[PDB]
């Protein structure tokens, strides 16, 4: 089955079921909530396509990875060009995470999408700065994945929209994120609504001490609006 969206397509054979975050499908801004900036413009295709990131190397000592949305896409393609020219935006997300493993690899990943993952720093009183948060396409690495780098727990992180990748049963995960904000539009260069976190709960393993699995993240903006500009 192919995830076809735009001139991008994720051409696979096995992908069982998406996760629809909080049961909500991404729709455009309805015509009673748009009292604001008049008729937020919709490219309808030009942003709404998969942006397949650089793959990360999962190994035995991997603590996990995170990308902040839309910070992971603010300098990529026609999404990232509209972020630099527009002031407001509204978008959901289709996220496809995929692993390339054999039947002799093992390990489990919690693929979790966190709404407004305000991070904490470790062993200090200073807040995280701009460079500690806004990592872009490269993303970040969990320093302490057990507390989710925010003082909470990873055990309870399944309260968020999540998917499991257990390499016995599946290697892919699909989360469909709606718009998640207290405002209908927001400001893409300085606030993130979602953090996609991929954390290995069970570490990777085969015998020959240098087991390694590619993890590929494909993010598609869904129903992506922006302010007028004309």
């Amino acid at each position: 089955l192919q995830l076809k969206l735009g001139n991008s397509a994720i051409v696979t054979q096995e992908a069982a079921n998406y996760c629809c975050a909080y049961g909500e499908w991404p729709n455009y801004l309805p015509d009673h909530e748009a009292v604001a900036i008049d008729k937020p413009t919709q490219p309808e295709t030009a942003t709404d396509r998969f942006y397949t990131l650089k793959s990360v190397k999962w190994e035995t000592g991997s603590t996990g990875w995170w990308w902040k949305l839309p910070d992971a896409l603010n300098n990529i393609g026609m999404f990232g060009q509209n972020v630099q020219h527009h002031y407001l935006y509204r978008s959901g997300f289709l996220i496809h995470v995929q692993c390339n493993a054999t039947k002799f690899h093992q390990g489990a990943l919690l693929v979790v999408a966190i709404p407004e993952h305000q991070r904490g720093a470790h062993n200090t009183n200073t807040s995280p700065g701009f460079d500690d948060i806004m990592k872009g396409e490269e993303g970040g690495t969990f320093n302490h994945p057990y507390v989710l780098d925010d003082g909470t727990s990873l055990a309870c992180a399944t309260i968020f929209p999540h998917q499991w990748i257990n390499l016995r049963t599946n290697n892919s995960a699909t989360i469909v994120l709606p718009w998640m904000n207290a405002a209908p539009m927001d400001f893409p260069l300085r606030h993130n609504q979602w953090t996609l976190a991929i954390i290995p709960v069970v570490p990777l393993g085969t015998r020959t001490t240098s087991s390694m699995v590619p993890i590929t993240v494909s993010i598609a903006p869904m129903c992506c609006e922006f302010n007028g500009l004309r």
């Binding site: 039947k103 002799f104 093992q106 390499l167 016995r168 393993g205």
Partner: peptide, 9 residues
């Protein structure tokens, strides 16, 4: 409980 070994375990 979820077993998280390999496919042939």
């Amino acid at each position: 409980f979820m077993f998280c070994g390999s496919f042939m375990a």
